[PDB]
Design a protein around this ligand. Sequence first.
Ligand SMILES: *[C@@]1(O[C@H]2[C@H](O)[C@H](O)[C@H](O)O[C@@H]2C(=O)O)O[C@H](C(=O)O)[C@@H](O[C@@H]2O[C@H](C(=O)O)[C@@H](O)[C@H](O)[C@@H]2O)[C@H](O)[C@@H]1O
Length: 226
Amino acid sequence: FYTAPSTESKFTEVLSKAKLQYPTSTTVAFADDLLDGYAASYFYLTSDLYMQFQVAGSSQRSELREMETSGDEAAWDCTGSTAHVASAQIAIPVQEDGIEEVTILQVHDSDVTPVLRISWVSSITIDGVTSEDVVLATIRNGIDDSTATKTVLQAHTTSRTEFNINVQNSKLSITVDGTTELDEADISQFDGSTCYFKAGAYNNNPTDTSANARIKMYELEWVDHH
Ligand SMILES: *[C@@]1(O[C@H]2[C@H](O)[C@H](O)[C@H](O)O[C@@H]2C(=O)O)O[C@H](C(=O)O)[C@@H](O[C@@H]2O[C@H](C(=O)O)[C@@H](O)[C@H](O)[C@@H]2O)[C@H](O)[C@@H]1O
């Protein structure tokens, strides 16, 4: 009894340029499946026209992964001259008890490393400063370095919020409701990698493995500019 996100034309293009992974990295719906009305408890259209992602369990996900309309996986040069831009209007609900971090947007390399995660966190401590209930950017310092540089982007609100990721040359910027919150962070550690965007709900380190992470997107797109 779930309504498909494909019923809203504002999602046709991104769905044509995506596949849906749930609950792990395996694809459950390709672009053609999505466009043909795919819907489930973990991926459906709400009555006020949000595409909602929901998932339980540690490191489990309900996530769109950027594709080309040709059926090729997106695999653009992470630090190339062509700009890559993802734009989303996201409402992050108050998360269920036991949910501690939910990744909502990513730039990921074509192997095993997230270049950027934008996530909601219950708490984070950065350079001795603890912030509660915030949206965070995490940029990995390298493929062979498990550490990352973290930047608080926004105090969590349930209100619909515009996120924009702009990747061009070896730099990455993030705007939140029109304000630059990460200005040309260096991602040269991904020279020679290829990359793609992701969007959805990726449940990181929950304390209750049965609780559902839940994220809603009112608009979503990813584009190239040459
Ligand atoms: C890291 O995020 C990982 C996600 O949790 C998912 O597993 C994803 O699939 O891959 C991400 C990744 O590998 O980058 O998780 C580690 C971690 O939890 O161990 C983070 O490293 C720690 O970061 C904290 C901190 O900076 O707050 C440090 O105190 C700690 O010593 C580790 O360096 C890593 O930054 C990142 O979030």
